[PDB]
């Protein structure tokens, strides 16, 4: 069953290309790093499960994502954290909230247009078999 490892290799490579495209985008630079504890001291008191695109790239290489659902759960976590933390008052707040939705939508859009359904389905079935 190297075919299962080839499937997981192929998945990781895909997910790296997607995460790369998001990380090089100027809009999502704020989501490439963890939140600055010194600049945003109350962030940790709101968000208990932080996520960013550096963490995602690390988890890809550690084999934490066996399915696209697993990957997109962390993408969603990045967005929901941003919408959970930031209020809807100042224009800086609205800029970041909008970028977070944009990050999520962009990820889902790329995957929808480039991921073969039968390949996604394969990965889902391999992890259930384990």
């Amino acid at each position: 069953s190297m075919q299962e490892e080839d499937t997981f290799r192929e998945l990781r490579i895909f997910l790296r290309n997607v995460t790369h495209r998001l990380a090089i985008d100027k809009r999502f630079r704020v989501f490439t790093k963890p939140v600055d504890p010194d600049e945003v001291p109350d962030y940790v008191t709101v968000i208990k499960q932080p996520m960013d695109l550096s963490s995602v790239i690390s988890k890809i290489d550690l084999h934490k994502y066996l399915t696209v659902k697993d990957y997109l759960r962390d993408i969603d976590l990045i967005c929901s954290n941003a919408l959970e933390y930031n209020p809807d008052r100042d224009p800086g707040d609205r800029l970041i909230r909008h970028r977070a939705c944009a990050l999520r939508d962009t990820a889902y859009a790329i995957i929808k247009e480039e991921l073969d359904e039968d390949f996604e389905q394969l990965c889902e079935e391999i992890q259930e078999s384990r």
Binding site: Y85, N86, P87, G92
Partner: peptide, 6 residues
């Protein structure tokens, strides 16, 4: 700080 960055 209160909520919001910057």
């Amino acid at each position: 700080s209160g909520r919001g960055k910057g």
